Amino acid sequence: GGMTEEEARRFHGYMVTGTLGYVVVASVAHFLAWSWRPWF
Amino acid sequence: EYQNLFTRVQVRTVPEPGIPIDESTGTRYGTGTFSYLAGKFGDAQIGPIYLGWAGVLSLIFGFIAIEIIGLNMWASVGWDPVEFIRQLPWLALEPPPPQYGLRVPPLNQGGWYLMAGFFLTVSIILWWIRIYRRARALQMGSHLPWAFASAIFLYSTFFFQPLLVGSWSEMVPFGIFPHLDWTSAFSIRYGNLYYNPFHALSIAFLYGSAVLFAMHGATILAVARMGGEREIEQITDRGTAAERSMLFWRWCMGFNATMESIHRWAWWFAVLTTFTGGIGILLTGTVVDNWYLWGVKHGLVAPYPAQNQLTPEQQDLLRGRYQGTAPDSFPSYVV
Amino acid sequence: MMEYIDGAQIALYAFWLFFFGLIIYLRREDKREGYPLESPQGPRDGWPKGAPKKTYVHRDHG
Amino acid sequence: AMLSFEKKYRVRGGTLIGGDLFDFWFGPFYVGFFGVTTIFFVTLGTLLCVWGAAMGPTWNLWQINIAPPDLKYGLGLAPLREGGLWQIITLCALGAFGSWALRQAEIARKLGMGMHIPWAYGGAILAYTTLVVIRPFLLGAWGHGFPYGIFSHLDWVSNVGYQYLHFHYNPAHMIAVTFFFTNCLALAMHGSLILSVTNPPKGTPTGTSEQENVFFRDLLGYSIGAIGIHRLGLFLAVGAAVWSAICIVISGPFWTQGWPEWWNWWLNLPIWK
Amino acid sequence: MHRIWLMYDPRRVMVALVGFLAVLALVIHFVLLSSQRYSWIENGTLGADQAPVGASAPAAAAEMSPLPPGR
Amino acid sequence: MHRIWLMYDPRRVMVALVGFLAVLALVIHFVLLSSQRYSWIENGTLGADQAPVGASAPAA
Amino acid sequence: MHRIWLMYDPRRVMVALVGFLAVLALVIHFVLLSSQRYSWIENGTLGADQAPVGASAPAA
Amino acid sequence: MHRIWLMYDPRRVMVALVGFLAVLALVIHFVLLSSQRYSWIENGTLGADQAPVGASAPAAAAEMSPLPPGR
Amino acid sequence: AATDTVQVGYRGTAMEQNYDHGDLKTKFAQVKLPQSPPPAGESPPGPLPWKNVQVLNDISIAEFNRTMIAMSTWVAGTGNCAYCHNVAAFQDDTLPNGKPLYTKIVARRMLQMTRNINGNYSQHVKNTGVTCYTCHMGKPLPNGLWFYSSQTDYLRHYLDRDGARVITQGVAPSNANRSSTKQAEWTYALMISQSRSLGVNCTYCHNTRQFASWREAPPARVTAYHGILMLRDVNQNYLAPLQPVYPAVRLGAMGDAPKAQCVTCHNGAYKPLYGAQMAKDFPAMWGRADWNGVPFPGI
Amino acid sequence: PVNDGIWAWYGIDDDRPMAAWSRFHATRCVEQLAINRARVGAAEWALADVQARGIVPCIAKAAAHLARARAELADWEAQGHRLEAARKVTPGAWTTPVI
Numbered sequence A: 001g002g003m004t005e006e007e008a009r010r011f012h013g014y015m016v017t018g019t020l021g022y023v024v025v026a027s028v029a030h031f032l033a034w035s036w037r038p039w040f
Numbered sequence B: 001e002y003q004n005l006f007t008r009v010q011v012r013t014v015p016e017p018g019i020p021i022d023e024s025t026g027t028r029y030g031t032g033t034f035s036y037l038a039g040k041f042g043d044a045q046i047g048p049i050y051l052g053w054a055g056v057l058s059l060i061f062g063f064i065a066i067e068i069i070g071l072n073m074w075a076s077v078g079w080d081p082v083e084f085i086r087q088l089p090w091l092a093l094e095p096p097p098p099q100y101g102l103r104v105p106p107l108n109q110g111g112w113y114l115m116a117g118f119f120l121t122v123s124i125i126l127w128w129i130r131i132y133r134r135a136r137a138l139q140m141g142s143h144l145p146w147a148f149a150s151a152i153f154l155y156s157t158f159f160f161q162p163l164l165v166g167s168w169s170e171m172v173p174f175g176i177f178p179h180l181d182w183t184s185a186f187s188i189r190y191g192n193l194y195y196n197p198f199h200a201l202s203i204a205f206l207y208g209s210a211v212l213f214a215m216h217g218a219t220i221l222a223v224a225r226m227g228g229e230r231e232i233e234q235i236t237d238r239g240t241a242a243e244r245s246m247l248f249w250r251w252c253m254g255f256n257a258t259m260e261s262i263h264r265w266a267w268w269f270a271v272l273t274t275f276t277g278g279i280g281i282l283l284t285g286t287v288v289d290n291w292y293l294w295g296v297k298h299g300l301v302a303p304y305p306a307q308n309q310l311t312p313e314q315q316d317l318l319r320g321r322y323q324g325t326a327p328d329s330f331p332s333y334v335v
Numbered sequence C: 001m002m003e004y005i006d007g008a009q010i011a012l013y014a015f016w017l018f019f020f021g022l023i024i025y026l027r028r029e030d031k032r033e034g035y036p037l038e039s040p041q042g043p044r045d046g047w048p049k050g051a052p053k054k055t056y057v058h059r060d061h062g
Numbered sequence D: 001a002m003l004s005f006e007k008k009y010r011v012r013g014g015t016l017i018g019g020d021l022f023d024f025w026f027g028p029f030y031v032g033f034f035g036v037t038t039i040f041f042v043t044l045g046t047l048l049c050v051w052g053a054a055m056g057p058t059w060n061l062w063q064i065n066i067a068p069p070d071l072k073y074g075l076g077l078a079p080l081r082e083g084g085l086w087q088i089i090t091l092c093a094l095g096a097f098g099s100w101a102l103r104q105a106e107i108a109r110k111l112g113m114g115m116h117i118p119w120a121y122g123g124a125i126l127a128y129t130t131l132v133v134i135r136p137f138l139l140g141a142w143g144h145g146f147p148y149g150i151f152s153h154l155d156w157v158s159n160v161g162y163q164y165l166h167f168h169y170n171p172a173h174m175i176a177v178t179f180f181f182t183n184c185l186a187l188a189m190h191g192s193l194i195l196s197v198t199n200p201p202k203g204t205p206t207g208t209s210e211q212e213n214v215f216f217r218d219l220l221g222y223s224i225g226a227i228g229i230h231r232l233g234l235f236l237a238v239g240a241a242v243w244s245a246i247c248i249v250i251s252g253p254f255w256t257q258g259w260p261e262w263w264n265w266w267l268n269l270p271i272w273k
Numbered sequence E, H: 001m002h003r004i005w006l007m008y009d010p011r012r013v014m015v016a017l018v019g020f021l022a023v024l025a026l027v028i029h030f031v032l033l034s035s036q037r038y039s040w041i042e043n044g045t046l047g048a049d050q051a052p053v054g055a056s057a058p059a060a061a062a063e064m065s066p067l068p069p070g071r
Numbered sequence F, G: 001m002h003r004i005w006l007m008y009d010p011r012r013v014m015v016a017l018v019g020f021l022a023v024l025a026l027v028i029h030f031v032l033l034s035s036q037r038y039s040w041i042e043n044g045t046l047g048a049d050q051a052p053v054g055a056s057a058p059a060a
Numbered sequence I: 001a002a003t004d005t006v007q008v009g010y011r012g013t014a015m016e017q018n019y020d021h022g023d024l025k026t027k028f029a030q031v032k033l034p035q036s037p038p039p040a041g042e043s044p045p046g047p048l049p050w051k052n053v054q055v056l057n058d059i060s061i062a063e064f065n066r067t068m069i070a071m072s073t074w075v076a077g078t079g080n081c082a083y084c085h086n087v088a089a090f091q092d093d094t095l096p097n098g099k100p101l102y103t104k105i106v107a108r109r110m111l112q113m114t115r116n117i118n119g120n121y122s123q124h125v126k127n128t129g130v131t132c133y134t135c136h137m138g139k140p141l142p143n144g145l146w147f148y149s150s151q152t153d154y155l156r157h158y159l160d161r162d163g164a165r166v167i168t169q170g171v172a173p174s175n176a177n178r179s180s181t182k183q184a185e186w187t188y189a190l191m192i193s194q195s196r197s198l199g200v201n202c203t204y205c206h207n208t209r210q211f212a213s214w215r216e217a218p219p220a221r222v223t224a225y226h227g228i229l230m231l232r233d234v235n236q237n238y239l240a241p242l243q244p245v246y247p248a249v250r251l252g253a254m255g256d257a258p259k260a261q262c263v264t265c266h267n268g269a270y271k272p273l274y275g276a277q278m279a280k281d282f283p284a285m286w287g288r289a290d291w292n293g294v295p296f297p298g299i
Numbered sequence J: 001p002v003n004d005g006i007w008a009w010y011g012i013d014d015d016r017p018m019a020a021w022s023r024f025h026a027t028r029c030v031e032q033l034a035i036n037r038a039r040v041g042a043a044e045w046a047l048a049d050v051q052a053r054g055i056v057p058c059i060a061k062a063a064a065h066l067a068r069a070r071a072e073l074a075d076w077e078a079q080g081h082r083l084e085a086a087r088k089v090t091p092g093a094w095t096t097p098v099i
């Protein structure tokens, strides 16, 4: 199957942005968990 | 030297068998497919199944039996799904209390057990009928359903022996380690099952079944390069693979089967495992209550030097009681 | 009443009679191929005498 | 005597040791060098078993009991009355079982067969060698072997089992039992299928590989094929003996508590500790 | 860095990634749920100063010579 | 980003999703039912102040 | 040194490396979590002076 | 001495070598971690004089036995 | 990784005990190193001054003080007389607050219990005997304390139950024995507990080809039976009636007193303290007119 | 992967398209060229046989198989040309040509 470098560059734009957005959500979840009950 | 233990070159066919031989009533369920992993060890086709009326009902009755067991197990850990997986092999659905005998017990104290046992038994009988009908529809002999009837016979003795001694409490609990606890305690209650001669015979055929399948499996693989695995053609049109198989065992141990008759030795060894087993269970607690003492009477038991000697006052002191009911109170001892 | 004879002993001898009968049957089946034996003294059957060699009918196809 | 097709096959060749010297038959039996050694060890081992019976309390077949030595003798040969006779018989039995396997290889070679049968029998020899050599040696005394006696060895099996309180909880034993039970099921299915196509109801043509594959397919949901069922039967039967040898060698040398408390690791997985 | 997707089928990548994150998330929740400090379904309403803490190293003498609980 | 459905066959995704959501929903409900605090079948009619709370630290 | 990527397929070494790191990381975390000293989920808020220590020699 | 390598594929040599070192390293670590003296995750903060040392002798009272009596 | 074995039955019967050699050495050294040493003892004349002594009437004043030092180190740590006493007034059974010294009134009962064990149950404890150290081992709480929980709890074999037999002593079934397979499971559970309590396996007390056989069993089975009868007396007459004496922190959820079991003395060893003989050194606790021929030094 | 098999788990893969010089890929290429030319020869012999006996649905598949054998050969010829170009520009490469 094909996969051109413009398709790869378009996919990378979504894959990075989705990854970072998920890490941002997770960062808020840890901010909430820590303010509720710190683990250190 | 090629060992013929796995297949380095499989071949696919685009149309397929799995569309059955001409079969009449019922329906072929699903479309045939190939597994490459199945094709490594055996034939690659994973494919269509037949049920008919007896197969459908067997699955319905059997599913209910499985649900009742699992739901009771899950209830027994207070519906905790973590403890359900963590403790799964220790969980059971447990038979009724002994004091009921054969009477119907309370729902949470064996009533669910007898229900699951009933639907499982009906499901097993309907599966036997399903196999019997399928063997005849494919225009085959009835060897397989009668072999399966031998397994069902042993299974039924886990109902009939409790019936004969007069209590559903004696039945086998549904559960992985709990049914092994029962298996040990059965031998304890009846004074060591090693001295039951039908148990000894059942082991002789269980071991013999491994001996025969090891010998026969190896023999056919050893002649498979000469077409020896085409066993039906070696039976109808004897080739050198059959002749060499006969001569190997003849030259080894002085006698041999044929390519057909080795499958009769195979069939009877497997069938006699569970048939002699069932007889031994039915005799236990009904004819013999202590198999070791039956062994002493009939001369089975090898003598050992005494490890202790009791005085006559110890003989009275060291008798116990038979086990009774549990204390149904929490005593205060204060005065 | 019979002290020594009991139902487990009776059942065991019933099995032995059946089992030896079965071994005889299986040994007759084992002798449908390769028998009677060739020997310098002429043909030999052993014991029990083998069942006859069996003919198989193939199908007429469809 | 000979099977009607046999004479053609009785060539010289395929021996491992003796060459032509022992390359002959006695009635149906092939001899060879390992046939000679087999009969030596069989006769010596049997006559010593009969001597053990003679000096024991009874001739009753079920009650004869030739016991290993006390544990205090360690890895030495005990006095013959005291277990040394068991130790000699054990050497004869090893010599016989080994000779039998190597004789089977000479027979397979003479027939141009694969070596499957000698090796499949090696699984049983392994299990015996584990019970009387490897496990006793790891425990440090020959007295850990089982006694030679039709029921007295069952007393040994019983007591070894309860040395671990509840031997059913041995995890390798569960696997070994599963193989033995699966093997007996598979043997009944394979035996039934072949007989059902070769002995169909009267007035029915002889069946075919297609019919047995179709029947087998709707029994298990997949078709195993002719080579596959023989590979499986060999795998299950020999695998049972190998897992049996594992289950007994771990009991004592490697694990000493009750077997039920081995399962404590499963309760303590950190997802649910 | 985008050329990593020339090297791997993105349909295989995303499925493996989502399966990895699902299993990791499940494992961390169930590890916490079995602890005492983070048994949040039973004890989540406790304040942080009231939540359980795994016990310290002993009192430095690490030794016994007690006095009874009061009757 | 509807073109996600071009690289993934939605026929496969919707079955995978519904299977996941079904199992996860049941696991959560049974975890709660198994707990003291949320054993709602036996104790659902208790008020929030009456509902059980797991044990604190010992000095608390 | 970049010439090793002609000797070995980068596509396959990367998968093997990611797998190796994941296994090693999970092993070390669970080894620590099972210890007394580093049972950080229960005792992570203890100060370093308060955390458990494995028993010393009696020095006698 | 380099002629030793003419017999071998160098890629396979390296894969063989790395596998040997990985196994050996893990064996030595798990042996030490299972010891008393080098159980460093629990006791790594002990000073060298404070760390465990194997007994130069055992001892007993004369009537005590670790093993039960028996032939 | 070496395994020690002890043969306890005939050749070839596999009646053997197995021990992991490393595990056993650490357990054994863990007993040796803490094992509390005894004071030397001495022989004065003169009449007893005591104001409120009710059990130890029969020993000299020096032997009495020697016994109190032992009791302190065995239950409370050495010299900890404040654990039991209002140390200003040893004769008191109450604090200055008037609230009772519950430990002292328990300890008086534990003296009577120990004398009763060493005296009436010599078929079990023989000349090893027990001291406070056997259970307490230097701490206020022994191991293996148990409370009421469920009716079918097998530890009630050590209190208010009696029968455990399930095997028929004849070939044929009879009305004499109607035991359930469930009852054999219950005895099996009980017997695993006894095996673990001593760190032994079933072959220590049985030839498992016939569990009911006494002739084929090692003699330890007879000692074990006397241990059951001893625990029933200990629990029913001494430990369980202390319910109104303890603070409610000691009581079970049913409000019952803590009870003992085999593991309380044995602590996973075939004899308590691997057979350390201490009762001989403390005549205050013999309950017996002579210990292995050494006569009781009564007044 | 049929050629490297288990060693593909460790990232040895000498089939992959290669444009720098590599003695391992050149070795694989020389082996596979010979095998695929023999395989093309057998495929067109089989077509000639089945054309001669005239069975229409078999002639169709024999031609389809031959086309696939030619295509699989052409890939190895392309690999051979890449490596042979790289051989000429790279010191210490083979003296015997690829393809």
Ligand SMILES: CCCCCCCCCCCCCC(=O)OC[C@H](COP(=O)(O)OCC(O)COP(=O)(O)OC[C@@H](COC(=O)CCCCCCCCCCCCC)OC(=O)CCCCCCCCCCCCC)OC(=O)CCCCCCCCCCCCC
Pocket (backbone or CB within 6 Å): B204, B205, B208, B253, B254, B255, C020, C021, C023, C024, C027, C037, C044, C045, C046, C047, C048, D001, D002, D026, D027, D028
């Ligand atoms: C509980 C679950 C059990 C589960 C396990 C169950 C195991 C069952 C399988 C084993 C039994 C079958 C063995 C067998 O068939 O061997 C072939 C042999 C002879 O073959 P043949 O083809 O009929 O004849 C050959 C002859 O015509 C020409 O041969 P040749 O001239 O070259 O050599 C002369 C013969 C002379 O025959 C003998 O020496 C007989 C030797 C002993 C025969 C078996 C006796 C019973 C068992 C052993 C007891 C002594 C054992 C120490 O030489 C030979 O043929 C030697 C080759 C045969 C060697 C057979 C060895 C079998 C060993 C079996 C061990 C069983 C252990 C339990 O057959 C016979 O001699 C007759 C066998 C009859 C069936 C046995 C069952 C009889 C049930 C009782 C019915 C009433 C009384 C007969």
Ligand SMILES: CCCCCCCCCCCCCC(=O)OC[C@H](COP(=O)(O)OCC(O)COP(=O)(O)OC[C@@H](COC(=O)CCCCCCCCCCCCC)OC(=O)CCCCCCCCCCCCC)OC(=O)CCCCCCCCCCCCC
Pocket (backbone or CB within 6 Å): C043, C044, C045, C046, C047
């Ligand atoms: C308890 C039951 C199970 C344990 C049982 C153990 C003892 C078994 C003894 C019988 C086994 C016979 C095996 C055999 O060869 O079978 C085929 C053969 C005929 O088949 P064929 O194909 O036509 O020929 C084959 C050939 O093998 C037969 O031998 P052949 O005719 O060529 O050569 C000669 C004889 C030797 O006979 C003589 O020399 C007789 C001469 C008598 C003339 C009169 C002299 C004057 C004074 C007489 C006074 C006479 C009164 C003093 O063949 C033999 O050598 C046979 C050797 C068999 C050796 C078996 C060894 C047993 C294996 C274990 C040994 C160690 C452990 C004990 O015979 C038959 O067909 C007749 C039926 C035989 C089996 C059914 C009868 C069973 C008898 C026992 C009944 C009770 C059952 C519970």
Ligand code: BCL
Pocket (backbone or CB within 6 Å): B066, B120, B124, B151, B152, B154, B155, B182, B183, B184, B185, B186, B187, B192, B193, B194, B198, B199, B202, B203, B204, B206, B273, B274, B276, B277, B278, B280, B281, D157, D181, D184
């Ligand atoms: C301490 C333990 C006791 C002991 C107690 C027992 C008891 C009790 C029994 C056996 C039995 C057997 N024992 Mg024993 N056994 C001991 C020691 C041994 C040793 C040994 C090396 O020590 C061995 C090899 C054996 C071997 C054997 C077998 C020969 C025999 C079972 C045959 C069989 O195929 O069963 C396996 C086959 C079946 C159970 C048949 C099942 C068929 C049915 C139809 C399947 C239904 C499946 C269904 C559709 C799906 C259900 C799904 C779930 C509901 C979820 N025992 C000691 C002495 N043993 C049995 C026997 O026959 O005794 C005479 C028996 O009842």
Ligand SMILES: CC[C@H]1c2cc3[nH]c4c(c3C)C(=O)[C@H](C(=O)OC)c4c3nc(cc4[nH]c(cc(n2)[C@@H]1C)c(C(C)=O)c4C)[C@@H](C)[C@@H]3CCC(=O)OC/C=C(\C)CCC[C@H](C)CCC[C@H](C)CCCC(C)C
Pocket (backbone or CB within 6 Å): B056, B058, B059, B060, B061, B062, B063, B066, B123, B124, B127, B128, B131, B144, B147, B148, B150, B151, B270, B271, B273, B274, D181, D182, D184, D185, D188, D189, D219, D220
């Ligand atoms: C000769 C003795 C040996 C033996 C033989 C033997 N067993 C046999 C046979 C034979 C010859 C068979 O032909 C038969 C078989 O089918 O084999 C595949 C069988 C069999 N041996 C079995 C097991 C078995 N055999 C054992 C042992 C033995 N089998 C002996 C060793 C053991 C042991 C050792 O414990 C076991 C557990 C089964 C696999 C099988 C009989 C299957 C059967 O009866 O199943 C009944 C059905 C159920 C329990 C219900 C299943 C429920 C589904 C999961 C529900 C799915 C949902 C469903 C679709 C809903 C319904 C909707 C409808 C609208 C469709």
Ligand SMILES: *[C@H]1O[C@H](CO)[C@@H](O[C@@H]2O[C@@H](C)[C@H](O)[C@@H](O)[C@H]2O)[C@H](O)[C@@H]1O[C@H]1O[C@H](C(=O)O)[C@@H](O[C@H]2O[C@H](CO)[C@@H](O)[C@H](O)[C@H]2NC(C)=O)[C@H](OC(C)=O)[C@H]1OC(C)=O
Pocket (backbone or CB within 6 Å): B324, B325, B326, B327, B328, B329, B330, B331, B332, B333, I160, I161, I162
């Ligand atoms: C609570 O009651 C149960 C049921 O009696 C007792 O358990 C009994 O003993 C076990 C051996 C056995 O396992 C079990 O089946 C059962 O038989 C349990 O131990 C508790 O006992 C105390 O209460 C008894 C009771 O039944 O209420 C009481 O028994 C006596 O008094 C009742 C009247 O209150 C009378 O009906 C009984 O006949 C009588 N029995 C005896 C033997 O005296 C116990 O009193 C005594 C002295 O045993 C109570 O036991 C104690 C120590 O308080």
Ligand SMILES: *[C@H]1O[C@H](CO)[C@@H](O[C@@H]2O[C@@H](C)[C@H](O)[C@@H](O)[C@H]2O)[C@H](O)[C@@H]1O[C@H]1O[C@H](C(=O)O)[C@@H](O[C@H]2O[C@H](CO)[C@@H](O)[C@H](O)[C@H]2NC(C)=O)[C@H](OC(C)=O)[C@H]1OC(C)=O
Pocket (backbone or CB within 6 Å): I091, I092, I093, I094, I095, I096, I097, I098, I099
């Ligand atoms: C604890 O209480 C017991 C009560 O029995 C005191 O025991 C006394 O001394 C024994 C030798 C004697 O055998 C016994 O009969 C009894 O006389 C024990 O000494 C402890 O005493 C303190 O608490 C006593 C209490 O009962 O609460 C208290 O005594 C009170 O009662 C008596 C009359 O019975 C009276 O004389 C006291 O004045 C009265 N005191 C109070 C505070 O209520 C003891 O008081 C005194 C003066 O001894 C308490 O001890 C002290 C040092 O105050």
Ligand SMILES: CC(C)=CCC/C(C)=C/CC/C(C)=C/CC/C(C)=C/CC/C(C)=C/CC/C(C)=C/CC/C(C)=C/CC/C(C)=C/CC1=C(C)C(=O)c2ccccc2C1=O
Pocket (backbone or CB within 6 Å): B211, B212, B215, B216, B217, B219, B220, B242, B245, B246, B249, B250, B252, B253, B254, B255, B256, B257, B258, B259, B262, B265, D026, D029, D030, D031, D035, D036, D038, D039, D042, D043
């Ligand atoms: C000791 C002594 C003094 C001996 C005197 C005689 C002398 C001098 C002998 C010299 C020559 C020698 C060395 C002889 C050997 C003597 C000995 C020791 C014989 C003992 C033989 C022996 C082991 C007998 C036991 C038989 C038993 C019980 C076997 C168990 C298995 C069993 C039940 C098998 C029956 C079914 C059969 C026949 C299986 C084999 C078999 C299999 C497995 C196929 O797959 C197959 C496939 C296609 C065609 C045929 C076959 C076939 O025949």
Ligand SMILES: COC(C)(C)C/C=C/C(C)=C/C=C/C(C=O)=C/C=C/C(C)=C/C=C/C=C(C)/C=C/C=C(\C)CC/C=C(C)/C=C/C=C(\C)C(=O)O
Pocket (backbone or CB within 6 Å): A010, A011, A014, A015, A017, A018, A019, A020, A022, E014, E017, E021, E024, E027, E028, E031, F001, F002, F003, F004, F007, G022, G025, G026, G029, G030, G033
């Ligand atoms: C408690 O004890 C223990 C448990 C032991 C402790 C723990 C220990 C350990 C070891 C933890 C390890 C953690 C870890 C390690 O790396 C964790 C690593 C986590 C990572 C990397 C997460 C990455 C997430 C990325 C996501 C979610 C991406 C989403 C992508 C989206 C949404 C894009 C959608 C669009 C697409 C696809 C394009 C379509 C095409 C289009 C439109 C087109 O073509 O046009």
Ligand SMILES: COC(C)(C)C/C=C/C(C)=C/C=C/C(C)=C/C=C/C(C)=C/C=C\C=C(C)\C=C\C=C(C)\C=C\C=C(C)\C=C\CC(C)(C)OC
Pocket (backbone or CB within 6 Å): B066, B067, B069, B070, B071, B074, B114, B115, B116, B117, B118, B121, B155, B156, B158, B159, B171, B172, B173, B174, B175, B176, B179
């Ligand atoms: C929601 O769905 C869930 C998640 C719950 C599904 C999951 C279910 C799970 C996890 C199920 C797990 C099941 C397990 C692990 C089962 C284990 C079973 C074992 C090991 C069984 C072993 C032996 C059992 C035996 C031998 C039982 C035999 C019973 C018999 C013969 C009973 C016969 C009863 C009869 C004939 C009853 C008749 C009814 C009358 C009224 C006549 O009463 C006598």
Ligand SMILES: CCCCCCCCCCCCO[C@@H]1O[C@H](CO)[C@@H](O[C@H]2O[C@H](CO)[C@@H](O)[C@H](O)[C@H]2O)[C@H](O)[C@H]1O
Pocket (backbone or CB within 6 Å): A009, A010, A012, A013, A014, A017, A018, A019, A020, A021, A022, A025
């Ligand atoms: C996983 C849980 C959810 C986390 C949150 C996810 C959202 C995070 C913020 C998203 C913000 C917008 O994110 C941005 O979207 C655009 C499309 O609009 C993507 O754009 C991509 O596709 C377009 C075509 O569709 C191309 O022309 C472009 O070159 C490419 O980058 C960007 O790569 C991304 O950076």
Ligand SMILES: [Fe+3]
Pocket (backbone or CB within 6 Å): B216, B220, B231, D190, D194
């Ligand atoms: Fe076969």
